[PDB]
C-alpha cells in the first residue's frame, strides 16, 4: 500500500531529508525534490522533502531522530506518505528555544542556529515540529509556537523569522533529541545489529510473547575493554526501542552497606518488571558479582546469589531484558553465563580505523572544525584508541583551541556568537596524538586487513592455492556439502625469511573479508617462558568469535629455536604451547570459517604432529620473491613516497636476483632516508623525490640477507614434500 | 533452588531449608530437588564463612534425618561432582550419582523433535542434518538453536501482516526453513563443545577392510567377555583387560577401536596424545583418574589411548632424557589400570606407532599383555578407505576402485584419505570454473590426476623395523614341534 512504509535509520545528519527508492515513487507519482506531509502516530504529523536512494529497500522509508520524534514513532513502526497538497509559503513563522536545550547559552539566536539552518534550505515546518540544528559545539532544538499562513508552511529566504523569547518549558511525553541513538555510535555496525536483533521482538513485539511462548534471550553481557561505548550502545538501544531504561551501577550496588545492596537489586528488578518492556542493564557487572571463589564477604556472595535468583525469575514473560556490561568475560561468575541468565555474549572489541573515523565525526559534529583537519588521517593514526582515547583526544584537541584564544575576548551566560567562532586546527589534532596514551595499545588487533592481492606480485600458484583453502569454503559452501567434504582448516607456509608469508596471508583474509589475527613468535614465547599456554585458548576464543577468521602463527618455530634446533635440549619436537595449539586445532568444527596459518623459516624442527591430517596438512612453500614480486614490493614501499618517474624499478628489480622482501625494503629505506638526508642538508644550506641517483646510492650497501645454502635447503625440502613418488604415469585400464 | 537459598542473609536460609524437609514429609511421598547443589553445599574447605559451613550442615543433618522410611526421596542437580562437599556423597545422604551427560546424535534429534513438536515447520527442514552437525550441543544449546531459527523466521515476517490477544490464524501461519538451521548452526557457540566424549561410535567392521585376523583377535578380547560372560566362569578365567595396538601412522588402529566398540554397541572414550601431553606438561596427571572414572561409569566402556607414546617422543627417544621409560603421567594409567575390576568390562586399548618406546611395563600381565601388529593396510583395506572416503561423495561408477588399489602397495589409508582429498577437491576446483564460466561427479580422470601426486607416508626401513619388532615379539621359540607323549 502506498500509505503503509516502514521507519530506518537516515544515512545522512540532514534535519527534514527523508530518503525512499524509485519503486516507492512509482506508485506514488512524486518528485525527487516534492514535500509530502508525514501523518504518524498519536494524531501527529509532520512535513518533510523525499530523496531518492537504493540502499533502503522497495517499501522502507529512511528518516532522522528528529522528524521521526516530530512524528512520535521509532524504527520499523508503520507511516504513510500523504503528499502535502503544496502548501504555499511562509510568511513570518515564530520559533523559540526550549528552555532545558537553551540553559547556559544565552543571546541572540537569529545568526548562530536560525538563519545559517534555513540559508538556502527550503524546509517544510508545521506548527508542532520542534527541530534540532548543531552549532557553537552544541546541538540545541527550536519548536514552532505558531505559523500565520495555514499549520504548514515552507521557509522562504525573505520570511521574517521572529524569536521574542521565554523559552518553552518541556514538554510531558517528549523526551530529549539529543541524548543517545543509534547515530550516536561509531561504526559497532556488526554488533549494534547483533543487539538490535536479540532485543526487536522481546520489547517491540511484547504481546507475541504473551501469546507465542517462544523463549527470546533474557541475558545479554556486553563485554569488551573499558571506554568502548558499551553503556552508550546499551542506552541507545533502550533510547530507540523506547523500552524504560533502567540503569545499575556495579559500585554504587556495591557501596551501600549489606542490607540496601540486595534490596536495591530486588527494587530494579521489580520497579522494570512494573514498568512494561524494560532493559535492565547492570553496568560493571564484574563490580557486582565476580568469581565467587575470589570473594572474601559474605554480602558479597549474597549479592551474587541475589542476582542469581532475580536472573532466573526473569524467566516468564515479563518483557524485562536484562544487559550488562563486564571487561572481565571470564571474571564474572560463570554460574552468570548459564542458559537463562546471560545466554548471549557481545564482543564490542576495538574499533578499526573506520570506527575511529565515524567516532570521531561524531564527536565533532557540534564542533565548528577547520578546512585543515583531516579526520581521517587522524583516524589512521590512533592505534589501540577505543572510543574513549578518540574522545578524549577530541576534546583535548577543542580545549588546546580554547587555550590558544582563552583572555583575548572575554568569555565572562555568555552570548552565542562568541561561542560559534571558535575553530580547531589539524595540528592541534597532531598535538594530542603524541599526547594520547592509548588504553588499548596493547590489545589483540581483530581487523579485517588492507593488504590485498595487488600488494603482493608473483606468487600466482601460491595464491591459487591460498584461496583454494579460503576463498572456495568460504564463497562456494554449496561444494564441500554436493561432494561431501570438509575444507582444510590449515596451511603452513615455509620458505626463507622476508618473502610474503604475512601479506598473503593479510591478502586472503582481505579476499574474504575476514578478519585476521595473527600471533607472533614473541607471544609463542611469553607463553612458553611463562608457562601460561593456557591463553592458547583464549586466542582461539578471540578466532571464534570473529568468525570467520584468519589465525595467523606467524614464525611458529619460535619455541623450537628457543630449545635449540631439531631435537632441541634433550626432548622430542612437543612443547606445551604449541600442544596447547594442537588441542585447539582438534577442538574447532570447521563450521566457523576460522583458518589456520602457520608461518615458519624452519619447517624441519616444526613438530610433525602439527602437519597431520586435521591440522595444518597443507605445507605451501612461499620462496623467494620473483622479479614480478620485487616490483610489488618496491611500489608498494614507494607508494606514500614521492618517487621519481624516471627510475626503473623494473630494472632495479633485475639485479636483485636472489633479494628477499625484507632486502629491498632496506633498499627503499636507504635510498628513501638518503633523500631525507639530502633535504635537511639542502635545508639548512637554503635557508622533492626520491632520485635515481639516491637509489643507485642505496643498491650501493645492498646485501642480499638469505644466503644460498639455505635457500638450498629450503629447495631440499620442497623436494622431499612435494616431488611425490613415480605416480605420474598411472591410468584407469581401458 | 542453590541460589535461592543462599540469596537470603544468615538466617532464613537455613529456616528455609528446614521448612521444606519438613513440607515434604508433611505432604505424602514427595521429591525434594535441590537445584545448584554446588551454590548451597561446596567443599567445605573452599568456603569462607560460617553461615556457608553451617548450611553444609545442616543439610547434611536434614539428609540424615531422612533416613527414616517418610517417603521421601532427596533429588540434587549439581555440575560439581567433585565440588560438592564429600560428606554429602557418603551412604545415606546421597548414595546414587546419576552422570546425565552430553546427547549423542540420536539424543540431539530426540531433544530437536520434542521441541520443534509445537512449531510448524517446513519441509524442507531435515532436523536429521542439523542433529548430525550440532556436536558439543547439550539440550539447552539445542533449545537455543531451535528457538533461534524460530525468531528468525519470525524476523523475515516481522511487520507484513500485523501482529497487534493477537487472532490465532496468523500465528498457525509460520514456517521455519532449513536454512535458518544452518545459520544458527554458524551462530551456535556450543556450551560443551570442549567437553570428553562418551557415545557408541558408528564405525563398523564394513568400513575397515581386511585384517581379518587382527578383527578375529579383537572380538576374542572384547566381544567374547560381554557377549558369552557364560564362559571365563566354567572355565575360571578372567578376560585380559588392555590390548596394545602398534604399527605405522595411518593403518587404523582408531577404526578397529572404534569397530569393536560399535560391535558390542560399547560407549568409546579415546584420550589422543595432546591430552596426555597436556597432563605431563602440566603436571596434571590426577585427571587420569578422572579418565578412567569416566570409563567405569560409562561401563561397557573401550578406553582407547591413542599415540600413547606421546609423551616417550616428547622426552626424546627410547631413553628419553637421561631419565627411563616411566613418566608420571603412565605411571598413573598403570596405576588405574591395577584398579580396574574386569567385572566392568571395561577395555583398554593403547595405539602406538613407536613401541620401541613404550614403557615395558604397561606390557605386563594384567595390563595391556596382548600387543597386536596393524600393518600397512592391504587391497581390501585400500578398497575400504577409498569407499568409505568417497561414500557421501559422488563418484562416478567407472572409477575402478579395486584397480586403484592395486599399485597403491605400500600406501597408508592416510595416503589413500589424501588421494581423495585431492581428488574430490580437484573436482570442487572444477566445478568451480565451471560455474564461473557457464554463468557432478569425481570422474576417473580427477582420480588420475590426484594420484600424479601420490606419495607414500612411510618409507621401507620404517615398515622394516615394524616387521621386525613383530617378529621379536610373535616368532616366539621353537616349540612349535612340542607333543604329548602317547
Ligand atoms: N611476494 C611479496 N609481495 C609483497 N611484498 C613482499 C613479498 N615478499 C616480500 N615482501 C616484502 O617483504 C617485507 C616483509 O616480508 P614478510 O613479513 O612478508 O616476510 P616473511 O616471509 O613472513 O618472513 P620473515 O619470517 O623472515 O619475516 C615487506 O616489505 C613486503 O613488502
Ligand atoms: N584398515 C583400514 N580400514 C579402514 N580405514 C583405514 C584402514 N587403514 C587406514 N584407514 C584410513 O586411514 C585414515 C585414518 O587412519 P587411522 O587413524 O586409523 O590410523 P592409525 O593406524 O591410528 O595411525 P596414526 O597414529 O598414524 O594416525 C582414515 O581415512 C581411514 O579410513
Ligand atoms: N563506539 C563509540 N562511539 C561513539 N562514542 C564512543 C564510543 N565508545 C566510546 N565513546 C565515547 O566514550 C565515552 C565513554 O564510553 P563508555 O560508555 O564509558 O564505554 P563503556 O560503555 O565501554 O564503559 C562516551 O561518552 C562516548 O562519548
Ligand atoms: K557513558
Ligand atoms: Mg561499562
Ligand atoms: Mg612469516
Ligand atoms: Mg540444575
Ligand atoms: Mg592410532
Not at 26 to 34: I, P, S, Y
Not at 48 to 74: G, H
Not at 136 to 165: L, N, Q
Amino acid at each position: 500500500r502506498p500509505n503503509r512504509l516502514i521507519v530506518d535509520e537516515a544515512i545522512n545528519e540532514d534535519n527534514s531529508v527523508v530518503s525512499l527508492s524509485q519503486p516507492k515513487m512509482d506508485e506514488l507519482q512524486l518528485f525527487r525534490g516534492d514535500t509530502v506531509l508525514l501523518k504518524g502516530k498519536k494524531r501527529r504529523e509532520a512535513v518533510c522533502i523525499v530523496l531518492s536512494d537504493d540502499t533502503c529497500s522497495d517499501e522502507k522509508i529512511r528518516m532522522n531522530r528528529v522528524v521521526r520524534n516530530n512524528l512520535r514513532v521509532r524504527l520499523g513502526d508503520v507511516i504513510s506518505i500523504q503528499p502535502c497538497p503544496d502548501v504555499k509559503y511562509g510568511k513570518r513563522i515564530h520559533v523559540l528555544p526550549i528552555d532545558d536545550t537553551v540553559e547556559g547559552i544565552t543571546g541572540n539566536l537569529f545568526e548562530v542556529y536560525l538563519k545559517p539552518y534555513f540559508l538556502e534550505a527550503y524546509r517544510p515546518i508545521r506548527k508542532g515540529d520542534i527541530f534540532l540544528v548543531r552549532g557553537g559545539m552544541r546541538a540545541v532544538e527550536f519548536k514552532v509556537v505558531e505559523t500565520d499562513p495555514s499549520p504548514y508552511c515552507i521557509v522562504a529566504p525573505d520570511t521574517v523569522i521572529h524569536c521574542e523569547g521565554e523559552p518553552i518549558k518541556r514538554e510531558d511525553e517528549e523526551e530529549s533529541l539529543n541524548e543517545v541513538g543509534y547515530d550516536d555510535i561509531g561504526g559497532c555496525r556488526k554488533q549494534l545489529a547483533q543487539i538490535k536483533e536479540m532485543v526487536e521482538l522481546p520489547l517491540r513485539h511484547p504481546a507475541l510473547f504473551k501469546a507465542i511462548g517462544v523463549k527470546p534471550p533474557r541475558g545479554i553481557l556486553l563485554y569488551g575493554p573499558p571506554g568502548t561505548g558499551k553503556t552508550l550502545i546499551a542506552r541507545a538501544v533502550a533510547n530507540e526501542t523506547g523500552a524504560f531504561f533502567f540503569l545499575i551501577n556495579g559500585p554504587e550496588i556495591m557501596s551501600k552497606l549489606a542490607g540496601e545492596s540486595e534490596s536495591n537489586l530486588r527494587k530494579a528488578f521489580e520497579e522494570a518488571e512494573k514498568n512494561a518492556p524494560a532493559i535492565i542493564f547492570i553496568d560493571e557487572l564484574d563490580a557486582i558479582a565476580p568469581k565467587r571463589e575470589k570473594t572474601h564477604g559474605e554480602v558479597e556472595r549474597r549479592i551474587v546469589s541475589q542476582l542469581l535468583t532475580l536472573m532466573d525469575g526473569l524467566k516468564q514473560r515479563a518483557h524485562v531484558i536484562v544487559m550488562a556490561a563486564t571487561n572481565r568475560p571470564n571474571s564474572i561468575d560463570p554460574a552468570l553465563r548459564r542458559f537463562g541468565r546471560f545466554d548471549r555474549e557481545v564482543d564490542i572489541g576495538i574499533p578499526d580505523a573506520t570506527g575511529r573515523l565515524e567516532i570521531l565525526q561524531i564527536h565533532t559534529k557540534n564542533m565548528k572544525l577547520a578546512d585543515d583537519v583531516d579526520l581521517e588521517q587522524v583516524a589512521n593514526e590512533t592505534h589501540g584508541h577505543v572510543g574513549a582515547d578518540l574522545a578524549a583526544l577530541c576534546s583535548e584537541a577543542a580545549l588546546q583551541a580554547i587555550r590558544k584564544k582563552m583572555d583575548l575576548i572575554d568569555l565572562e551566560t555568555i552570548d552565542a556568537e562568541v561561542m560559534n567562532s571558535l575553530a580547531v586546527t589539524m595540528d592541534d589534532f597532531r598535538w594530542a596524538l603524541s599526547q594520547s596514551n592509548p588504553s588499548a595499545l596493547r590489545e589483540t588487533v581483530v581487523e579485517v586487513p588492507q593488504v590485498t592481492w595487488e600488494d603482493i606480485g608473483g606468487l600466482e600458484d601460491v595464491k591459487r592455492e591460498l584461496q583454494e583453502l579460503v576463498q572456495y569454503p568460504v564463497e562456494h559452501p554449496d561444494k564441500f556439502l554436493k561432494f561431501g567434504m570438509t575444507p582444510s582448516k590449515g596451511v603452513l607456509f615455509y620458505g626463507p625469511p622476508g618473502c610474503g608469508k604475512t601479506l598473503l596471508a593479510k591478502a586472503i583474509a582481505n579476499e574474504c573479508q575476514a578478519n585476521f589475527i595473527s600471533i607472533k613468535g614473541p607471544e609463542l614465547l611469553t607463553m612458553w617462558f611463562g608457562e601460561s599456554e593456557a591463553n592458547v585458548r583464549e586466542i582461539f576464543d578471540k578466532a571464534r568469535q570473529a568468525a570467520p577468521c584468519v589465525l595467523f602463527f606467524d614464525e611458529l618455530d619460535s619455541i623450537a629455536k628457543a630449545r635449540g634446533g631439531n631435537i632441541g635440549d634433550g626432548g622430542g619436537a612437543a612443547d606445551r604451547v604449541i600442544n596447547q595449539i594442537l588441542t585447539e586445532m582438534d577442538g574447532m568444527s570447521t563450521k566457523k570459517n576460522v583458518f589456520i596459518i602457520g608461518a615458519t623459516n624452519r619447517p624441519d624442527i616444526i613438530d610433525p604432529a602439527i602437519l597431520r591430517p586435521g591440522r595444518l596438512d597443507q605445507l605451501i612453500y612461499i620462496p623467494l620473491p620473483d622479479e614480478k614480486s620485487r616490483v610489488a614490493i618496491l611500489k608498494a614501499n614507494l607508494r606514500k613516497s614521492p618517487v621519481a618517474k624516471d627510475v626503473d624499478l623494473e630494472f632495479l628489480a633485475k639485479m636483485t636476483n636472489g633479494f628477499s622482501g625484507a632486502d629491498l625494503t632496506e633498499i627503499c629505506q636507504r635510498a628513501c632516508k638518503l633523500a631525507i638526508r639530502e633535504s635537511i642538508e639542502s635545508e639548512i644550506r637554503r635557508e622533492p623525490e626520491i632520485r635515481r641517483d639516491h637509489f643507485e646510492e642505496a643498491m650501493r650497501f645492498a646485501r642480499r640477507s638469505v644466503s644460498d645454502n639455505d635457500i638450498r635447503k629450503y629447495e631440499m625440502f620442497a623436494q622431499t614434500l612435494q616431488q611425490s613418488r613415480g605416480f605420474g604415469s598411472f591410468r584407469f585400464p581401458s
